[model samples]
Target: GIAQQWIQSKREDIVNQMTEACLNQSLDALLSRDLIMKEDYELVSTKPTRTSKVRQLLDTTDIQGEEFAKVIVQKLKDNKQMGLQPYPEILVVSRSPSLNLLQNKS
Candidate 1:
């Protein structure tokens, strides 16, 4: 079972790496926005950007989904990156024990 365990461990590692990369990119964007924009600048202004009402749902939802959306918006503000290309469309993965372990380890 060594090969199986190795593959499992590698899968976990790859997932962790991707999760960390996304968090870093999001955080980097957030910092960049703070450095360049006015204190009152509205990154996710009320003005319509996308033709979808999904953003509305995100703003109103009382769940982690809302927070996830906020993070994308905040990161966009921080990075000063315009448009929604780099911003995450959704938070797909669940926060698991492994993620918690990673956070605690860090």
Candidate 2:
């Protein structure tokens, strides 16, 4: 399902824009260099993880967050014919992270 969704979303122009945004290289510049394949992803379907009944309500989604980002990056690179570059690492910003830092919690 993830791959299918990604393929469906694929567009050469849009992908080129995303690749430039991520890699800080213009589409025209990337096309001037040699292209190489650095990463490949395969979808492996399997049964859901076994969990205790008590924690069933807390079950996390089956999708791997890191993998999802990786696949999108790969797709962008593939469509733009750009070399694999380092991915940007940004801190996750949300009320959750700050909420944990509140010193007044009892």
Candidate 3:
């Protein structure tokens, strides 16, 4: 039983760290305009849910940074007045690589 508990604790720690890394990377990608989508997103827990996870992610970062500030303001506005409903998972819209192809053809 003790061995199992130790293994579980290690697994949870690893999962938490990995989740943090992904969240940070996603935020960086957003700032850099990398256009991430659901395919690249992960919701780490049901306890916080994606909405709360997003809030946590924003809260833990430097919100005053120029790019980060814009995102935060827009997200707050969106939450308040945009009439958007929460999704089970977060949906991040970013530039698609194929967009350049279409633009070039135009």
Candidate 4:
């Protein structure tokens, strides 16, 4: 059981690291206008299927999430206004709640 616990912790750590890398790459793609496709944005914003983790651990409720989405959307809008012609199809679609199992419990 103890070994199992260690293995589980290790797995979680790896998952967290990979998630961070994915998020970073997604952000880079967005900034570079490579994430303009709907499928690309959808993939980036998708919640992890295997790991039980939260996107924003400190923030409670969906307010923070909504604000975060709004900011990103606003940036896109500003770019549009400035005639920066890239990622025009990309938009903030939705803001999701934390992925933590105990998100609503706490």
> TM-score winner among the candidates?
3
The CA lDDT at 37 in model 4 is 51
Against the true structure, candidate 2 reaches a TM-score of: 0.21
TM-score versus the correct structure, for each prediction: 0.23, 0.21, 0.27, 0.21
Clashes of each: 7, 0, 1, 0
Which ranges of candidate 4 are over 4 A from the true structure? 1-14, 19-25, 48-106
Check candidate 2 and list the clashing pairs: none
Error of 4 at 48 (Å): 6.1
Residue-wise lDDT of candidate 1 within 81-106, one digit each (tens)? 34333232233324423333222111
Instruction: Look at candidate 4 and tell me the lDDT of residue 34.
Output: 42
Leading candidate by lDDT: 3
Writing each residue's lDDT as its tens digit, candidate 4 over 2-23 gives: 2222222344443343445443
Clashing pairs in 1: 29-78, 29-79, 30-78, 32-78, 33-77, 33-78, 33-79
lDDT of each model, Cα atoms only?
0.36, 0.31, 0.37, 0.36
**lDDT pick, better of 3 and 4:** 3
Clashing pairs in 4: none
Report model 3's TM-score to 2 decimal places: 0.27
| Model 3 local distance difference test score | 0.37
Error of 1 at 60 (Å): 17
lDDT of 2 at 68: 38
